[PDB]
Amino acid sequence: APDTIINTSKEENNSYYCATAHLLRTDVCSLVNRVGIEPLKSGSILSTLEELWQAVGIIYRLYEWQHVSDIDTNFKKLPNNSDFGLVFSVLDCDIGYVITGKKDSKGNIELYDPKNSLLIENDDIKKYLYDENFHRFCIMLIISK
Amino acid sequence: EENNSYYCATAHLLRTDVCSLVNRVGIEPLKSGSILSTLEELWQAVGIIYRLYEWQHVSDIDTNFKKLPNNSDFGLVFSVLDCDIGYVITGKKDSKGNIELYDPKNSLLIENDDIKKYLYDENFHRFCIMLIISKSE
Numbered sequence A: 001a002p003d004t005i006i007n008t009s010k011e012e013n014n015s016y017y018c019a020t021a022h023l024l025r026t027d028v029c030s031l032v033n034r035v036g037i038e039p040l041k042s043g044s045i046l047s048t049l050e051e052l053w054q055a056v057g058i059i060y061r062l063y064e065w066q067h068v069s070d071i072d073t074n075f076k077k078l079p080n081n082s083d084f085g086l087v088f089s090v091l092d093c094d095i096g097y098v099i100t101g102k103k104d105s106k107g108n109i110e111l112y113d114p115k116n117s118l119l120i121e122n123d124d125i126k127k128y129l130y131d132e133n134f135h136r137f138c139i140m141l142i143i144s145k
Numbered sequence B: 001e002e003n004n005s006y007y008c009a010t011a012h013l014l015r016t017d018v019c020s021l022v023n024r025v026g027i028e029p030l031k032s033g034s035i036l037s038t039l040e041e042l043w044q045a046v047g048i049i050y051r052l053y054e055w056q057h058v059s060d061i062d063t064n065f066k067k068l069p070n071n072s073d074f075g076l077v078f079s080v081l082d083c084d085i086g087y088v089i090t091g092k093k094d095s096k097g098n099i100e101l102y103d104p105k106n107s108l109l110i111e112n113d114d115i116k117k118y119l120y121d122e123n124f125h126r127f128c129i130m131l132i133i134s135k136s137e
């Protein structure tokens, strides 16, 4: 349940905190006052994203590392009205990077990068994944809260 | 009752028993109709921190085993031809790198070589590994 917030600063405003707070529809202050300030567990953003979801009670299904060429095939197999996390490997990043996404009733995809306030809809999604130097990806589909 | 694989599998991995697990936790029902969902929700409750794997066919299981690091405890949720829901067993990759599987509800222990025979006998179709990172007994 949301607390009063100013988006806070330093490094609670990381992808994985920011992506998790958007999907739970809460804020990063509610996220640090419960659970705490999570360091990078085991060096993998995936591991720290997963264990942040375990801490806050998100029940998810995981889809393993694949090349970004076959991402629309994963998009097509997702159920309609579904929210999910998206961990990407990046050419100029030594760790992963997390964005959020949703599938609407009509089967469209919308992607949201909360840390950079970036919102992408179908028909701009291909250009975005290319512009962002995304290579591999891993989808975390929420089942329940 | 509470003699269910997911409770029994979680209590075997935690090095405890289900009755002292259930005064913790309570008796949580089948969340979302999913044995996977119920295992995840039971593990978050008790503090088992896991890495979730993609559902995969049982044929590709020896490769998943092959990539697991030594000294690993894990759960394994199976799809079963004659079961409407999943079934949970426990697993280990010890220091020497052998795989051992334990079905707690039916007290069965399976080691390498018998694993292909075992998974075929049990009518398992796909599977999903939950690798333990952290316990709090």
Ligand SMILES: [Cl-]
Pocket (backbone or CB within 6 Å): A025
């Ligand atoms: Cl709202």
Ligand SMILES: [Cl-]
Pocket (backbone or CB within 6 Å): A044, A046, A047
């Ligand atoms: Cl990883």
